[PDB]
Design a protein around this ligand. Sequence first.
Ligand SMILES: CCCCCCc1cccc(Nc2cccc(F)c2C(=O)O)c1
Length: 208
Amino acid sequence: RGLGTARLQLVEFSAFVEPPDAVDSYQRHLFVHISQHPPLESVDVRQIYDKFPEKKGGLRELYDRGPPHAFFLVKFWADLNWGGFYGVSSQYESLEHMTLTCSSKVCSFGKQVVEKVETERAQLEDGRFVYRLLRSPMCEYLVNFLHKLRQLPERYMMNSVLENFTILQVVTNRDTQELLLCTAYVFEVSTSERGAQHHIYRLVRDVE
Ligand SMILES: CCCCCCc1cccc(Nc2cccc(F)c2C(=O)O)c1
């Protein structure tokens, strides 16, 4: 129905830039945004194996580890129409008290180029636990990437570059090493006039 299981739901995800201005009058630009404050379409995981690494922490090894219902594909239309602060903010919820490990991998032509690993202990909210990874500074690699992408002279060239750029997020129970959520991200640029959009799929593999 949405990005999440009964065990862990994504409330909100965004990657953004706050101009130096923002101290005077506060602005933020969203490169991409999901808020989850009708069942999903499905995509065969086999069709995207090669956009991600092989061996450990590759999509095939992770899917075999399971559980299979925990795997999602997000297609983003990134808004690239904008020395500020580059940030990433993630919020999850559960009925269960856990310590999460959240691993984010950037891949270029299916190869790992940069990885960020964060742990977040649960905090009590109104009849649920919340995991708040807010305003995490964007790594130099992606800030630099976004500045270059911004400057290409055609949208189709931006989309051709993004064809070979993916992100894999794996959220695990730090204590039991159970996988809770695995999200593969693929990317296109939005038009000049349109903001960030996404489509969420279930990732499936034929039992057959
Ligand atoms: C074309 C638009 C790209 C938007 C990317 C948004 C996004 C989406 C998801 C995660 C991240 N961050 C990372 C991802 C992987 C490894 C990392 F080091 C980072 C990090 O910044 O530390 C960033």
